Every structure is written in C-alpha cells, then in structure tokens.
C-alpha cells in the first residue's frame, strides 16, 4: 500500500518525508490556498491519516482570510471556540502557551476532527509545540491494559483545573459535560486511539482516588517523548493535525513574551467505541459551535 | 440451597454464626480432634467455603500433635515451610507478627489451599489477625477493572521486600528464607476449584506484573490491594488462649498486626496441600525457578 | 506522654482501671458509671486517660439514655450542635445510621475543629459495623526525617463539598488547616488530613492524590488502629484532636444507630504556632472556640 | 550580572543565543579545537553554567582526536565508563538510543560533571536528544516539596543483552543526596534519574509514588531542551545539573553518537554532607576533581 501512496503524493506534486516514527511529517512542493484542486487537497488529507501532524514552511502569502479559505478544503470550519469570543469570531487567536497535554474541545459531542494553525507572533526563543500519537499509544499497550481501556468511559468538561484569571472566567461562562469512550475508533482510518487529555474529570464507574492514578498512567504512554512530535516555530509555517489522533502541548518556555498563533478548526463527529456506542452528552448545547460531520472512510484504510 | 447448609450444620450438631456480612465466622458445639467424623469434617468444609475464615473457641485440649492430626483431615498437610526449616518440623512456629498483607506461600505452583492456626503465646493487648476476602474484592470491581484483572498475570517470589522479635533474629531468618529462590507466574484471577468463585491472587510474594514495565506495577498493586483490604471485606479477630483459625488460602489474604510492642507473640500453623491455579480460561501457572515437590503433593480437587 | 506511677496514682484515686487495648491507641476504664454527676478528679483522670490513649471504651453503661449521656458529656466540654449544617438528625445528639465509611477526623471542614465526641449504641446488627480508629499522632511519631519536613510546612484545604449530602452541603465550608498540628492539651504533634481535604495549598491537582494516600496510608496502617465491636452498654470516647475514625459497612442491610454528643474545640495551630484560616463560611451557631488548657503531665 | 557576561562573551568573541527559558543555548563564533585560547575556554565555561546545555554548529573538522582535545581544556577526561570497555577506550561510542531519563553516571561517588557529544551516524528521521535543567526543577518547588527534597537522600546503581552483561560486570551502589549544591554555581539541583533504586528510610511502596512525582517535575516540557541533529553538531552539557534522553523514534535505523566525558567531583547536600560509598571503586573511572566557583555566582 505503501508505493500507492508515494503515487499519490507525486502526481498531486508534493513530497512528504516523515520526521518521527510515530507522528510528524513535513510536506513540500504546495502553497496552500482556497483554490488548491481536489486531487491535491485529497493527497494533503491521505497524507494527514497517515501522519497524524503535517508541517508546511515558506507559507508567507497565507493571512486569516487564505488560512480560512484552504481550511475550508478540508472540512466545514466551527466557530473559534464553544465559550471563548474575545478572541476572534472567524479564526481563535491563541496567546500565550497552552500548556497542558489535550485533544481540542473534548468536551462537547462533535469533537473537532482537525486544525490548522500558523504563527503571527513569536518569541525569541522557545514556545514549540508538540504533538503525541494517541494512536501509537493504543497500539502499544499490552493485552490487559487493552482490556481495561476499550471498556473505559470518561466524563470531559471545560471547567478544567489577571488576564489568565478573565480568560478562564469566558471559558467556563456555560458548563458542558460529555462522557466519551477512553478508546474510540477513527472514523476515516478505522484506527482505535485513546481520547483522554486534559479536559478527562473522571472514569465511569471508578472511584475519585483511582482515577488519578489511571489517569497517570494512561497520560504517560501516550506523552512517551517516541511517540511525540516538537516543532519550532518560524515565520511562514503552518500546522495540521489530526485531533481525533492526537493530543498537543504549546510549551511555556519562552518568558514575557509575546507568542500569538491563528486556528482554524474543522466540524467532527461524535466518538464512538469498539462496540459503535456514541458518546453521551451529560450538559450543554454544541451546536452554535459546530454541526456533527458525516465522516467517510478513507478506501486505503 | 441454604436448607441443604442448615441441614449440614444440623447433622454435624455445630452452629455457624457469621461475623462479618464477606468474610468469618464462629463455629460452635465441636471439638477439633484427629478423629472428628466425616459429617463433621463435611460441615466444617463447607462452612470454610462459604465463610472464608473460621474461629473455634475453648479449644484448650489441642496440643501441636493434636492441631495436625485434625488438619489431617481436611487435606495432606505440607511441610511448615518449602524454605524455612529452623521453626518447626511438623508445624511452623510462627514469631512476632506477620505484618505485610500474603496469602500464604504463594511463590510455589501448588499453593496451599488452607491453613490451621492457634495461639501459644499471646501479649497482654494487640496482636490481633485480619484476614481479608479476595472473593469479595473481585466481586466489587467494575467492569473495566475486571476486564483488566482477568488478563493480568503476576510473577511471586521468596524473594520479597519488631513485633518482640530482634532486628537479627529476623535477619537469619530472612536468610533462610531465601536460601533457595522461587518464580512462579500466576493469574491475578483465579477460579476457585472447588466453590467455583473468582478471586483475586496478589499479595507481598507478587514482584512484577507481566508485559508491564515497574513503574505501572507499583501503582496497579497499590490499586488493587487496597481494593482487597478495603475494611468492609475483613475480619479481625482478638486472640485468645483456646482459640483456633482455619482460612480458605484460595480466597483470602491476611495481616498479623504487630502493635503489641516489645511482648511475645507465638502461633503454630498446619497448612494443606492445595492445586495449581488457574485463571478464567483454564489455564494454569506457571514454574520460572524452583521444585516445591519436597514441600507438598498437588491435590486433586473437588467441586463442592 | 506515658503511663507513669503519678498517671497511675490518678487513676488508683479517682477509682478506676484503665487497660490498654493497643500499643498506640485505645484502653477500657472500668469502675466507673458514666453519669453527669460524676465528681471533677474523676473526671479529670477520664480526660487524662484519654489524652493518653486517644479512645477509651466502658461497658455495661446500661442506665444511660440520651439525656445522661449528654450530661455526662457535659463534664468534659461544652456540647457543639449536632452538626454545623445537619439540622434533622438531632437537636443535642447527632443520631448516626448506617455506617460513616470513609476515614475522617470529624467536621475538619470548620475553623474549630471539635475537641472529642461520646458515642454509644443504640440499635446494632447482628454482625459486623464496627468501627476503628486510627491515631494520627502515631502516624507523624512514625515518619522519617524528609517526610516529617515535608508535613510540617503542608496546608491543606478543607470542605464539606465531599437527602442527607444535600442539607450537609447546604452552606459551603472551606477552611485552610495545616497538616501538622499541635494538640493544645498534650503539646504532642498529629496528622490533620482525613476525606474531608480537597487539596494542598501551592501543590496540583496530579500531586493531590498521590501526597494525600500515601498519608492516609501512614495514618491508616493496621498497627495505628484500635477497632472495636460494638455491644449494647458500650460507650466509646475519642480525641478528635489525634484520631481519624471509619465506620464499617460490614452488616448488610441491618439497621444500626449510634447516638454521638461532640464537645467544642478550638483552632488549630501549626508548628510554629499559626491558625488555620477561614475561606468560606461561619460555623459561630455550631459553637464557639475553647480555650484549652494544656495538661501538667505533657 | 547580565552586562558582565554579555561582556565576557563578547570579549572572546562568541555569541551566546537563548534557545529556552530555563535551558539551551547556541554559540556561535568558535571552532572547537585543543589550542583555543584560556578566554575563550572560560567563556564556554560561563555560558554552559548559565544555560547548562551549549549546541555547536558546523564544526566538521572535529574527529575523536579533535573532540578530546577540546574537552580536555574543559577538565580531565574520564575513562568511557567504568564498567563498558568493549565501546571506546578514549570516547564513548554510543550506539542507538539511550531513551531513559537519567544523569550520566550516577552510581559512582564521582559524577562526571560534563560531557562533550557528536554525533557521526544520524537516522533519516528522529533521534533527537532531550536534556532537563534538575536546577529549574528545584527552583519550582513549592516550600514543603523543597523542605521535603533538602532532607532527602537515594541509593543509585548501575543494576538497572551482552552490553547489559558487561555494564553489570561489576557492582556500585552509592548513596546520593537528592538536593545537591552545585560547586561552581552554588545553584541547587535535584540529583536522581533512572539509575535510582530506593529512597532512604522510605518504604518501597512510597518510592514509586515519590519518584514519579519528582522525575514528573524534571521532564516537564518547559524545562526541557530537544535537539534535532545534524553532522557538525557539538553538544556541550553540565552533567551536575541536566538529566537527558535520546528519543527512540527512528525505528531501526543506524544512530552513532561519540562521548567525552570530564570528571567531577562528590555531591555535597544543603548542609555540606558528602555522598557515601556503599559498593565500588571507581578510582580507575576518574579521579575526583577539585572544582572552582566561577565568581559571577
Ligand atoms: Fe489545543
Ligand atoms: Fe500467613
Ligand atoms: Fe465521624
Ligand atoms: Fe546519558
């Protein structure tokens, strides 16, 4: 299967040449646009489900409007965020470092399936991102912690633990609740891969004092640096990523300074288990955020 | 089911009174010799599978001779230990207090499916037994846990990590006890051969988890342990000169508390010869390192 | 803070025995009728006693009912509510059903931690529901060096936020109480922790839970704990300054009731001899703040 | 202090760039070689206190002979390891990944204190080296967590397939503080890492629990430097202060990386106690090393 792909790749003109053994790949030979043909567009999507994260460089045309406008290639953009408006209504305009290991808004039922991401403003120094294979994470586990997992549910919420204050303050305004399977199976590659992150409150069924300790252990094998993905940033670059086979971490190693990166993110489904059961929404309302995608199954999957 | 009990109980003209609503119970109106008859001996079997620990009272006629010809008839009594040989020859005499949650000997293939134990030297206060019921334990699990357990194997060893006994002499002990080495890989689940019922096997003898690395062993073990000696699943008994225990070591583990001080404390023990576990799909452990033919035969089991 | 020949002239005087159950915690006192008439060098020697031993159990009480066992818990302080929050289960005894299964030293959640509770028997079942008691003044006796520093500098916040839950969190407490305190009676250093703490002042959530159960797990070692099974007659004492308590749900679906009078305390202090501080809330309706008075003996 | 070292810098003409907040730094300006001058020698010396892990680029002249000359101006050259013999007998030759966190050669009394790294196989993909700052670590606890660390000591090993054989030849156990003053900085660094076996007068159970938490502290992402490498790269690193990892994400193919390392001398805890000896010798591995402050600390 593997030369059907190089093909791909080369008659949508583009090379794609792998940075881990997990996750990461740099793609080159495009400039991404609104206007990319189909063919190119679906070699860029292939080449995601592969790698899980793709990097572009030298991408100095693209500005809000370009971003948006090739995001749109590949799904139907959600607004910025479920809860956070100050920060922009078509693109969300991250400051800082989002430090702490997390797939994007787990805690609605349409969980988004990808994201796009350039930088506006970087610091001198530090503030890379890095992404983990929680897919790789599943394949590694050994049989009795496959049992355990495939059986998990957890519950996600938004009311996770001055201006930092004022921004946590417009993120939980409305409270959301959604239990979601600890393993689901990706809808378009039919790979199972571990949904926890940042925004897990709990396990069904499990004790306060056992999820802790679960919850380590689990975080620490998808977070294994192997399976992980770290980019510096330039001027020029942009990121894709496959949020229904990730998790990522913007690191706070930069001081003062100012770091700013444009998103746009793309309308998922609902997760569902090794058994096909949906998740289940406990609180809140998603659909000002996004609608509920129909996935398709990639024919090389 | 619970008139063909009673109806046991009746025969053998013992009562049976629970003391903890998963684990022990007082048995009464029967004196524990080597020549108790069959429906005794039946009724005593049965209240053990059903109650997981038994205590006896005024049982002030048994002498060490007398506790093995009784344990005799509950099964083929084992060496008092596979590696210990300086404290007893025909029971072990155990010092100070067992303070580390085990089911007995479980670093052998044929561990021990029971234990008679009596007290020969008691403190003035403390020195209490808690045994614990791993049934029980494996019945609370939810079912991502259970899935979890039920495939989970544990290597147990000799090898593992006061009470009036002196920091040397429990040195020279610990050599002995080491003097020969054990492996044996077990399920954490095993299958009960003769009540059927699922119970947990784990316990200090357990030093890793197989196709798990260290770090995730101690955080499981910590979990599951104190899943099993959560207090509503044990029973703690305060000695007396009289008094004998008999446990199920197929379905329980337990805990000498030494919080008597610098008094002595002195108990004899008779364990039987159990079988091979097996976990939930019928298969059994497995021998790394060591023979424990020279300490006990592997029983035959029947179902109750 | 032992069972010298003055401790034994205190008991030989005030006419009772007092046994130790346990190397670190628990004793029976007999010959002695709990009453609230009872003369003050008895009860003096009874507080001694349980400074001491941390629990004390007397039997055969028979003759007392609520009324006596309130006015013999008057004796040793001055009785709180019977719950900061919990108005229908009592107006002088708070009346305990089932099993309190989970290890706690009581209402840690205000800033006066009461002092002690009297508790007896009312209805128990046919097996099981005992309840055990650990001594957290044990537990720090036994920790190493690195581990003794870590809880002497340790703050922890906690709350009643753990038909019954709902007039329990009726109005929310948060109270910031070191790890450490120093009994105000015995000057003898104790854990503070228990199921009501929620978190540790400037630790994350990740580090909360392992800090916290490898404390509890010091606390709650089987050696640090006296567990009694209950008779009708027993009437139990304990310092809630230097124990935790668990009540065993052991005994099916049998009823059991128990009938506890708790005693006012004052404000923990830490090692350096600073307070806890309030957060949320105002427990002054439950009872006001004892001045101690620190034993001769200690 | 900051205009005196943008001075010293500048005066031995290197450029000294940040490439974290809390560790790393590129210099560039200087072609490591052995007849560098005593300046520019101790310009090195400053800014690897400072940033605890320098990266060199495009230094292709440097072979073995050139990569030991330079370090031996940095200090003196320990053996390759004390027990491995069979990979190097001037430099260390390291083959795959060493993807553990771990402080190099913890289990002897003398820890080396820095080691000079180049690579000369590199996999078409992944490899990278990570190093964390143990002072930034230390510099993060909250008060009781540092009350706990000051008071803290560990038992380290080497007992951690042929390779394995011969790094097990011989056994070391030696008793570290967990909180070690630097001798030169006099910053505070937490010593542990993977060859750490137990904790002093704790309970296995509670060493998990308590290991986990540090280490967990130490690799945190900010605190942490990742190198991608290229042939030319030099990696200079302060072993008294840096635990480091090298990322297994290359699948089989071919990574050769060669060490120096430089002999350190014996940790010393808050209250100026020494570490203790409990199995091995490793006087034939380095000799102990009378060390300097820098006076800018
Ligand atoms: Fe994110
Ligand atoms: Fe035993
Ligand atoms: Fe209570
Ligand atoms: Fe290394």
Request: glycine content about 6%; hydrophobic content about 40%.
């Amino acid at each position: 299967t593997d030369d059907q792909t190089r093909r791909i790749y080369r008659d949508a003109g583009i090379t794609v040449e792998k940075l881990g053994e997990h996750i990461g790949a740099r793609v080159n030979g495009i400039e991404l646009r609104g206007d990319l043909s189909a063919d190119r567009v679906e070699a860029i999507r292939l080449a995601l489900a592969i790698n899980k994260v793709l990097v572009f460089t030298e991408q100095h045309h693209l500005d809000d409007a370009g971003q948006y406008a090739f995001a749109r290639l590949l799904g139907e953009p959600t607004l910025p965020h479920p809860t956070v408006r100050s920060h922009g209504t078509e693109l969300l305009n991250l400051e800082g470092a989002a430090n702490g290991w997390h797939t994007d808004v787990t805690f609605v039922d349409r969980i988004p399936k990808a994201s796009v991401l350039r930088p506006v403003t970087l610091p001198s120094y530090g503030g890379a991102t890095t992404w983990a294979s929680t897919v790789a994470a599943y394949e590694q586990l050994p049989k009795p912690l496959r049992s355990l997992v495939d059986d998990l549910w957890a519950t996600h919420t938004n009311l996770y633990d001055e201006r930092r204050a004022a921004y946590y303050t417009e993120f939980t305004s409305s409270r959301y609740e959604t239990v979601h399977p600890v393993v689901r199976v990706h809808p378009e590659t039919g790979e199972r891969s571990l949904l926890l992150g940042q925004f897990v409150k709990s396990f069904q069924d499990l004790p306060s004092a056992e999820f802790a300790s679960l919850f380590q252990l689990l975080q620490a094998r998808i977070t294994k640096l192997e399976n992980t993905f770290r980019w510096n940033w330039r001027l020029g670059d942009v990121a894709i990523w496959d949020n229904r086979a990730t998790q990522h971490y913007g690191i706070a190693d930069f001081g003062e300074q100012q770091r700013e990166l444009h998103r746009v993110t793309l309308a998922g489904d609902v997760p569902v288990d090794v058994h096909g059961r949906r998740s289940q929404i406990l609180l809140g309302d998603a659909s000002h955020y996004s609608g509920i995608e129909t996935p398709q199954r990639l024919e090389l999957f």
